[PDB]
């Protein structure tokens, strides 16, 4: 009741942990999630869409399950690590998270890897 600790509005809060901006290709990273919410709900089930638009790799779950593209899962964790191993992957890559919900509607969140179009050095 009486100690160092400060609440004010956290109704939906998505921490991501900080990845690597720039993958070698043939590299795996983890994409650790972490949504910190109200939590009124103790079963809502909630929703996981993973899309693979360009590059080319598997999203794994830290179960070791694969995200299958376009498709979706069903789980109870707010929090936990993806691992996404990639190899045919050009330069800039983009990963579509759809995080679905019966009353959080939609959450997209797109990763983007490399990114940066420097192909070549100006000058050093």
């Known amino acids: 009741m009486n100690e160092l600790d400060i609440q004010q509005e956290y109704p939906f809060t998505v921490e991501s942990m900080p990845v690597a901006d720039e993958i070698a290709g043939d590299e ?15 079963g809502t089930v909630y929703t996981l869409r993973y899309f693979q638009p360009d590059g080319k790799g598997s999203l794994k779950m830290e179960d070791g399950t694969v995200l299958k593209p376009n498709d979706r899962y069903l789980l109870n964790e707010w929090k936990f690590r993806l691992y996404y191993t990639s190899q ?11 995080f679905e919900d019966n009353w959080g509607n939609l959450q997209q969140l797109t990763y983007d890897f490399n990114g940066k179009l420097e192909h070549h050095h100006h000058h050093h």
């Open 88 to 98: 045919s992957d050009k330069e800039a890559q983009t990963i579509d998270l759809y």
């Open 28 to 42: 795996t990273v983890e994409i650790r999630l972490e949504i910190k919410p109200s939590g009124n709900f103790i």
